Amino acid sequence: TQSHYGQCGGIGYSGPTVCASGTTCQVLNPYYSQCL
Ligand SMILES: *O[C@H]1O[C@H](CO)[C@@H](O)[C@H](O)[C@@H]1O
Ligand SMILES: *O[C@H]1O[C@H](CO)[C@@H](O)[C@H](O)[C@@H]1O
Ligand SMILES: *O[C@H]1O[C@H](CO)[C@@H](O)[C@H](O)[C@@H]1O
């Protein structure tokens, strides 16, 4: 997964695309999707 307040998705992101089992994939901005 990715950590809390980490990146699950982005325009130019290159890491885990799954949020933590305590966090969820959500959008903060069209260039940064956060794990909440
Ligand atoms: O997926 C999230 O939890 C994992 C541990 O269960 C971590 O390895 C990962 O990087 C995320 O924090
Ligand atoms: O989840 C934590 O580690 C991640 C990298 O493995 C980061 O993307 C995240 O922001 C946290 O620091
Ligand atoms: O995720 C991939 O692109 C990123 C920059 O947009 C790099 O920082 C990363 O290491 C990967 O190459």
Domain coordinates in residue numbering, the chain: 1-36
Looking at ligand 3, which atom is closest to the CA of residue 15? 1
What is the distance in A from the centroid of ligand 3 to the CA of 16? 12
Residue of minimum CA distance from atom 6 in ligand 2: 2
* The two structure tokens encoding residue 5: 């307040």
What is the distance in A from the centroid of ligand 2 to the CA of 8? 10
Per the entry, the structure determination technique was NMR
Q: Is 34 in the pocket of ligand 2 (CB under 6 A)?
A: no
b/e sequence 1-36, b meaning 16+ C-beta within 10 Å: bbeeebbbbbeeeeeeeebbeebebeeeeeeebbbb
Helix (H) or strand (E) holding 27: strand 25-29
**Residue (of 17, 18, 12) closest to 30 by Cα position:** 12
